[PDB]
Amino acid sequence: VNPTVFFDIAVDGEPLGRVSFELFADKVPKTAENFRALSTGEKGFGYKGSCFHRIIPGFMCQGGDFTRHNGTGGKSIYGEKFEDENFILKHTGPGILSMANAGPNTNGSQFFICTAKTEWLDGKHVVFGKVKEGMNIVEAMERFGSRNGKTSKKITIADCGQL
């Protein structure tokens, strides 16, 4: 029943590979639906063509700022921001998909893919999915990151949608 969406990743416009995600619509339906719709672009805006602006190896990959490309933008399908839906699910290890935010109830479109267990984020960031296929591709992306998060090459979402 839970939806699966994919990102096709490019590095300086060179294809890298495909990452797919299971979204936990059974446990966080509002947050899952935002990401699903941003991935298909069915509301008229979304993730296609956007970059991962912050990648810290041994920590996370962060993206979803499709309006300013640097961590200061983005918007949800519900408006500029929406509430923290629940914190049922925890940051248990690599492959977890969690919402970036700027305080309580400030979810937009930014998300991160954890590449480590990040338990200190539990109860503060809404977990809403997990990598299903292509974790090896996330690991390859990680290698273009750095300690301060700047990427050495431009890591983009070349295509995305629902499988």
mmCIF file of N, CA, C and O in Angstrom, residues 96-163:
data_model
loop_
_atom_site.group_PDB
_atom_site.id
_atom_site.type_symbol
_atom_site.label_atom_id
_atom_site.label_comp_id
_atom_site.label_asym_id
_atom_site.label_seq_id
_atom_site.Cartn_x
_atom_site.Cartn_y
_atom_site.Cartn_z
ATOM 1 N N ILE A 96 17.439 6.252 6.397
ATOM 2 C CA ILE A 96 16.258 6.924 6.933
ATOM 3 C C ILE A 96 16.046 8.248 6.182
ATOM 4 O O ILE A 96 17.004 8.956 5.856
ATOM 5 N N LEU A 97 14.784 8.551 5.893
ATOM 6 C CA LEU A 97 14.391 9.785 5.204
ATOM 7 C C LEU A 97 13.559 10.647 6.192
ATOM 8 O O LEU A 97 12.488 10.242 6.676
ATOM 9 N N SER A 98 14.081 11.831 6.490
ATOM 10 C CA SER A 98 13.566 12.696 7.548
ATOM 11 C C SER A 98 13.428 14.146 7.062
ATOM 12 O O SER A 98 14.144 14.600 6.182
ATOM 13 N N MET A 99 12.499 14.886 7.647
ATOM 14 C CA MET A 99 12.267 16.289 7.278
ATOM 15 C C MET A 99 13.265 17.220 7.951
ATOM 16 O O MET A 99 13.486 17.152 9.166
ATOM 17 N N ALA A 100 13.858 18.084 7.142
ATOM 18 C CA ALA A 100 14.605 19.229 7.651
ATOM 19 C C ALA A 100 13.602 20.247 8.174
ATOM 20 O O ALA A 100 12.437 20.277 7.736
ATOM 21 N N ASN A 101 14.019 21.047 9.142
ATOM 22 C CA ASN A 101 13.166 22.101 9.646
ATOM 23 C C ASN A 101 13.970 23.199 10.325
ATOM 24 O O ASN A 101 15.198 23.082 10.464
ATOM 25 N N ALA A 102 13.265 24.243 10.772
ATOM 26 C CA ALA A 102 13.882 25.415 11.395
ATOM 27 C C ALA A 102 13.256 25.723 12.729
ATOM 28 O O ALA A 102 13.263 26.861 13.172
ATOM 29 N N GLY A 103 12.755 24.694 13.396
ATOM 30 C CA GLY A 103 12.006 24.893 14.626
ATOM 31 C C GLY A 103 10.759 24.039 14.591
ATOM 32 O O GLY A 103 10.479 23.397 13.582
ATOM 33 N N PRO A 104 10.017 24.007 15.701
ATOM 34 C CA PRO A 104 8.738 23.293 15.717
ATOM 35 C C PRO A 104 7.770 23.718 14.617
ATOM 36 O O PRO A 104 7.609 24.904 14.331
ATOM 37 N N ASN A 105 7.174 22.739 13.954
ATOM 38 C CA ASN A 105 6.121 22.990 12.963
ATOM 39 C C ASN A 105 6.516 23.903 11.821
ATOM 40 O O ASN A 105 5.774 24.830 11.448
ATOM 41 N N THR A 106 7.693 23.622 11.244
ATOM 42 C CA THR A 106 8.209 24.407 10.137
ATOM 43 C C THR A 106 8.673 23.541 8.971
ATOM 44 O O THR A 106 9.630 23.887 8.243
ATOM 45 N N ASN A 107 7.983 22.426 8.760
ATOM 46 C CA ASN A 107 8.286 21.571 7.618
ATOM 47 C C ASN A 107 7.930 22.257 6.295
ATOM 48 O O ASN A 107 6.864 22.855 6.160
ATOM 49 N N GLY A 108 8.813 22.107 5.300
ATOM 50 C CA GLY A 108 8.574 22.637 3.962
ATOM 51 C C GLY A 108 8.771 21.545 2.934
ATOM 52 O O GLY A 108 7.987 20.597 2.875
ATOM 53 N N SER A 109 9.864 21.641 2.169
ATOM 54 C CA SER A 109 10.194 20.615 1.184
ATOM 55 C C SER A 109 11.558 19.979 1.410
ATOM 56 O O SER A 109 11.884 18.973 0.795
ATOM 57 N N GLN A 110 12.366 20.554 2.295
ATOM 58 C CA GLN A 110 13.718 20.025 2.539
ATOM 59 C C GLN A 110 13.725 18.776 3.389
ATOM 60 O O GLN A 110 12.919 18.656 4.332
ATOM 61 N N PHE A 111 14.622 17.859 3.037
ATOM 62 C CA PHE A 111 14.656 16.529 3.633
ATOM 63 C C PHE A 111 16.097 16.119 3.714
ATOM 64 O O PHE A 111 16.983 16.716 3.035
ATOM 65 N N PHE A 112 16.366 15.102 4.514
ATOM 66 C CA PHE A 112 17.672 14.515 4.449
ATOM 67 C C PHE A 112 17.584 13.028 4.482
ATOM 68 O O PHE A 112 16.654 12.416 5.018
ATOM 69 N N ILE A 113 18.601 12.461 3.839
ATOM 70 C CA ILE A 113 18.818 11.020 3.805
ATOM 71 C C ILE A 113 19.981 10.753 4.756
ATOM 72 O O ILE A 113 21.096 11.199 4.533
ATOM 73 N N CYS A 114 19.716 10.067 5.862
ATOM 74 C CA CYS A 114 20.748 9.757 6.835
ATOM 75 C C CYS A 114 21.671 8.690 6.295
ATOM 76 O O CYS A 114 21.230 7.748 5.623
ATOM 77 N N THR A 115 22.962 8.858 6.564
ATOM 78 C CA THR A 115 23.945 7.861 6.179
ATOM 79 C C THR A 115 24.595 7.272 7.422
ATOM 80 O O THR A 115 25.585 6.553 7.327
ATOM 81 N N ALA A 116 23.992 7.571 8.572
ATOM 82 C CA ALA A 116 24.384 7.045 9.863
ATOM 83 C C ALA A 116 23.179 7.079 10.780
ATOM 84 O O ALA A 116 22.190 7.690 10.473
ATOM 85 N N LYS A 117 23.275 6.435 11.936
ATOM 86 C CA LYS A 117 22.255 6.510 12.967
ATOM 87 C C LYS A 117 22.343 7.900 13.591
ATOM 88 O O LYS A 117 23.419 8.327 14.004
ATOM 89 N N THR A 118 21.220 8.620 13.667
ATOM 90 C CA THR A 118 21.260 9.994 14.167
ATOM 91 C C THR A 118 20.207 10.175 15.249
ATOM 92 O O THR A 118 19.250 10.926 15.109
ATOM 93 N N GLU A 119 20.416 9.492 16.365
ATOM 94 C CA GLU A 119 19.373 9.343 17.382
ATOM 95 C C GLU A 119 19.037 10.665 18.046
ATOM 96 O O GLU A 119 17.930 10.838 18.582
ATOM 97 N N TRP A 120 19.987 11.593 18.022
ATOM 98 C CA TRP A 120 19.773 12.905 18.639
ATOM 99 C C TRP A 120 18.713 13.729 17.889
ATOM 100 O O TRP A 120 18.244 14.746 18.413
ATOM 101 N N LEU A 121 18.327 13.299 16.685
ATOM 102 C CA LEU A 121 17.267 13.980 15.942
ATOM 103 C C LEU A 121 15.876 13.450 16.293
ATOM 104 O O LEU A 121 14.867 14.013 15.879
ATOM 105 N N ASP A 122 15.813 12.353 17.035
ATOM 106 C CA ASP A 122 14.516 11.765 17.384
ATOM 107 C C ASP A 122 13.648 12.754 18.176
ATOM 108 O O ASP A 122 14.103 13.407 19.124
ATOM 109 N N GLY A 123 12.386 12.881 17.764
ATOM 110 C CA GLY A 123 11.445 13.741 18.460
ATOM 111 C C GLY A 123 11.528 15.205 18.023
ATOM 112 O O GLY A 123 10.784 16.034 18.543
ATOM 113 N N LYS A 124 12.458 15.508 17.118
ATOM 114 C CA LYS A 124 12.654 16.862 16.600
ATOM 115 C C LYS A 124 12.426 16.937 15.079
ATOM 116 O O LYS A 124 12.029 17.981 14.580
ATOM 117 N N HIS A 125 12.740 15.858 14.352
ATOM 118 C CA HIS A 125 12.580 15.792 12.889
ATOM 119 C C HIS A 125 11.666 14.601 12.603
ATOM 120 O O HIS A 125 11.859 13.498 13.158
ATOM 121 N N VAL A 126 10.678 14.829 11.738
ATOM 122 C CA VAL A 126 9.699 13.799 11.371
ATOM 123 C C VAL A 126 10.282 12.796 10.350
ATOM 124 O O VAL A 126 10.615 13.149 9.220
ATOM 125 N N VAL A 127 10.423 11.550 10.792
ATOM 126 C CA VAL A 127 10.817 10.423 9.922
ATOM 127 C C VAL A 127 9.633 9.925 9.083
ATOM 128 O O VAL A 127 8.562 9.655 9.626
ATOM 129 N N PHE A 128 9.795 9.831 7.763
ATOM 130 C CA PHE A 128 8.656 9.514 6.923
ATOM 131 C C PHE A 128 8.935 8.515 5.806
ATOM 132 O O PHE A 128 8.020 8.185 5.041
ATOM 133 N N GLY A 129 10.173 8.032 5.703
ATOM 134 C CA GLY A 129 10.516 7.061 4.684
ATOM 135 C C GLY A 129 11.865 6.404 4.896
ATOM 136 O O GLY A 129 12.568 6.701 5.850
ATOM 137 N N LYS A 130 12.219 5.523 3.965
ATOM 138 C CA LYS A 130 13.504 4.832 3.970
ATOM 139 C C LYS A 130 13.899 4.481 2.546
ATOM 140 O O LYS A 130 13.063 4.205 1.705
ATOM 141 N N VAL A 131 15.198 4.492 2.287
ATOM 142 C CA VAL A 131 15.733 3.948 1.051
ATOM 143 C C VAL A 131 15.390 2.468 0.939
ATOM 144 O O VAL A 131 15.627 1.672 1.867
ATOM 145 N N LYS A 132 14.822 2.142 -0.212
ATOM 146 C CA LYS A 132 14.408 0.788 -0.575
ATOM 147 C C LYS A 132 15.435 0.158 -1.507
ATOM 148 O O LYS A 132 15.861 -0.960 -1.283
ATOM 149 N N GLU A 133 15.793 0.853 -2.572
ATOM 150 C CA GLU A 133 16.847 0.422 -3.477
ATOM 151 C C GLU A 133 17.819 1.533 -3.740
ATOM 152 O O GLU A 133 17.462 2.704 -3.730
ATOM 153 N N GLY A 134 19.057 1.165 -4.047
ATOM 154 C CA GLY A 134 20.073 2.137 -4.384
ATOM 155 C C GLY A 134 20.760 2.803 -3.222
ATOM 156 O O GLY A 134 21.260 3.901 -3.366
ATOM 157 N N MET A 135 20.821 2.151 -2.074
ATOM 158 C CA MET A 135 21.608 2.712 -0.995
ATOM 159 C C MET A 135 23.058 2.883 -1.432
ATOM 160 O O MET A 135 23.735 3.814 -0.987
ATOM 161 N N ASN A 136 23.520 2.011 -2.329
ATOM 162 C CA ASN A 136 24.885 2.127 -2.862
ATOM 163 C C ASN A 136 25.087 3.439 -3.628
ATOM 164 O O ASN A 136 26.206 3.966 -3.673
ATOM 165 N N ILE A 137 24.006 3.956 -4.217
ATOM 166 C CA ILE A 137 24.050 5.230 -4.923
ATOM 167 C C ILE A 137 24.140 6.401 -3.937
ATOM 168 O O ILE A 137 24.876 7.385 -4.155
ATOM 169 N N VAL A 138 23.400 6.304 -2.843
ATOM 170 C CA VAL A 138 23.524 7.296 -1.769
ATOM 171 C C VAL A 138 24.970 7.298 -1.232
ATOM 172 O O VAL A 138 25.560 8.343 -0.987
ATOM 173 N N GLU A 139 25.560 6.116 -1.089
ATOM 174 C CA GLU A 139 26.943 6.018 -0.621
ATOM 175 C C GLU A 139 27.910 6.671 -1.625
ATOM 176 O O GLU A 139 28.855 7.355 -1.236
ATOM 177 N N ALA A 140 27.646 6.514 -2.921
ATOM 178 C CA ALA A 140 28.469 7.151 -3.944
ATOM 179 C C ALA A 140 28.350 8.682 -3.893
ATOM 180 O O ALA A 140 29.340 9.386 -4.068
ATOM 181 N N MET A 141 27.142 9.187 -3.610
ATOM 182 C CA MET A 141 26.916 10.639 -3.492
ATOM 183 C C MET A 141 27.711 11.233 -2.351
ATOM 184 O O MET A 141 28.228 12.355 -2.422
ATOM 185 N N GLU A 142 27.778 10.460 -1.280
ATOM 186 C CA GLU A 142 28.382 10.877 -0.044
ATOM 187 C C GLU A 142 29.798 11.298 -0.312
ATOM 188 O O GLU A 142 30.335 12.146 0.375
ATOM 189 N N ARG A 143 30.413 10.678 -1.311
ATOM 190 C CA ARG A 143 31.843 10.877 -1.546
ATOM 191 C C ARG A 143 32.143 12.244 -2.159
ATOM 192 O O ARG A 143 33.303 12.696 -2.165
ATOM 193 N N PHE A 144 31.093 12.921 -2.622
ATOM 194 C CA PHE A 144 31.232 14.269 -3.184
ATOM 195 C C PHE A 144 30.972 15.342 -2.148
ATOM 196 O O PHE A 144 30.956 16.527 -2.462
ATOM 197 N N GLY A 145 30.727 14.917 -0.915
ATOM 198 C CA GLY A 145 30.548 15.853 0.183
ATOM 199 C C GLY A 145 31.846 16.205 0.887
ATOM 200 O O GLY A 145 32.941 15.809 0.467
ATOM 201 N N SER A 146 31.715 16.951 1.974
ATOM 202 C CA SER A 146 32.859 17.413 2.762
ATOM 203 C C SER A 146 32.434 17.723 4.206
ATOM 204 O O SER A 146 31.237 17.731 4.528
ATOM 205 N N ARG A 147 33.405 17.986 5.070
ATOM 206 C CA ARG A 147 33.119 18.219 6.482
ATOM 207 C C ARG A 147 32.178 19.375 6.696
ATOM 208 O O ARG A 147 31.336 19.306 7.576
ATOM 209 N N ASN A 148 32.291 20.432 5.890
ATOM 210 C CA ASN A 148 31.373 21.577 6.044
ATOM 211 C C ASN A 148 30.102 21.508 5.175
ATOM 212 O O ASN A 148 29.273 22.413 5.222
ATOM 213 N N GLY A 149 29.953 20.422 4.414
ATOM 214 C CA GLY A 149 28.733 20.133 3.687
ATOM 215 C C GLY A 149 28.717 20.529 2.218
ATOM 216 O O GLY A 149 27.878 20.111 1.488
ATOM 217 N N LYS A 150 29.696 21.297 1.767
ATOM 218 C CA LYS A 150 29.813 21.748 0.396
ATOM 219 C C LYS A 150 30.165 20.567 -0.504
ATOM 220 O O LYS A 150 31.018 19.743 -0.181
ATOM 221 N N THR A 151 29.550 20.517 -1.646
ATOM 222 C CA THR A 151 29.780 19.406 -2.517
ATOM 223 C C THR A 151 30.856 19.837 -3.512
ATOM 224 O O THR A 151 30.925 21.013 -3.908
ATOM 225 N N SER A 152 31.693 18.890 -3.903
ATOM 226 C CA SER A 152 32.788 19.171 -4.814
ATOM 227 C C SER A 152 32.341 19.135 -6.285
ATOM 228 O O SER A 152 33.025 19.654 -7.165
ATOM 229 N N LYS A 153 31.175 18.540 -6.524
ATOM 230 C CA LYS A 153 30.532 18.515 -7.824
ATOM 231 C C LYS A 153 29.039 18.750 -7.560
ATOM 232 O O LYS A 153 28.567 18.606 -6.439
ATOM 233 N N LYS A 154 28.310 19.176 -8.583
ATOM 234 C CA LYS A 154 26.889 19.477 -8.435
ATOM 235 C C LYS A 154 26.088 18.194 -8.536
ATOM 236 O O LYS A 154 26.157 17.470 -9.535
ATOM 237 N N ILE A 155 25.392 17.895 -7.452
ATOM 238 C CA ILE A 155 24.654 16.650 -7.323
ATOM 239 C C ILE A 155 23.194 17.010 -7.511
ATOM 240 O O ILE A 155 22.626 17.722 -6.686
ATOM 241 N N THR A 156 22.595 16.565 -8.609
ATOM 242 C CA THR A 156 21.224 16.935 -8.903
ATOM 243 C C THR A 156 20.277 15.741 -8.985
ATOM 244 O O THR A 156 20.680 14.567 -9.187
ATOM 245 N N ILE A 157 18.997 16.069 -8.853
ATOM 246 C CA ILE A 157 17.904 15.157 -9.167
ATOM 247 C C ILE A 157 17.508 15.400 -10.624
ATOM 248 O O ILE A 157 16.788 16.350 -10.948
ATOM 249 N N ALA A 158 18.010 14.543 -11.509
ATOM 250 C CA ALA A 158 17.754 14.675 -12.951
ATOM 251 C C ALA A 158 16.311 14.300 -13.340
ATOM 252 O O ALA A 158 15.729 14.882 -14.260
ATOM 253 N N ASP A 159 15.747 13.315 -12.650
ATOM 254 C CA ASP A 159 14.365 12.917 -12.876
ATOM 255 C C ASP A 159 13.878 12.327 -11.567
ATOM 256 O O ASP A 159 14.659 11.880 -10.732
ATOM 257 N N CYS A 160 12.572 12.347 -11.378
ATOM 258 C CA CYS A 160 11.970 11.733 -10.217
ATOM 259 C C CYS A 160 10.513 11.455 -10.529
ATOM 260 O O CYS A 160 9.916 12.040 -11.450
ATOM 261 N N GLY A 161 9.932 10.568 -9.738
ATOM 262 C CA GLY A 161 8.550 10.226 -9.944
ATOM 263 C C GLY A 161 8.138 9.081 -9.070
ATOM 264 O O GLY A 161 8.852 8.699 -8.149
ATOM 265 N N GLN A 162 6.975 8.523 -9.362
ATOM 266 C CA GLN A 162 6.437 7.448 -8.566
ATOM 267 C C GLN A 162 6.528 6.129 -9.326
ATOM 268 O O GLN A 162 6.127 6.048 -10.487
ATOM 269 N N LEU A 163 7.099 5.117 -8.664
ATOM 270 C CA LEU A 163 7.116 3.753 -9.164
ATOM 271 C C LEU A 163 5.927 3.010 -8.589
ATOM 272 O O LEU A 163 5.345 2.213 -9.301
#
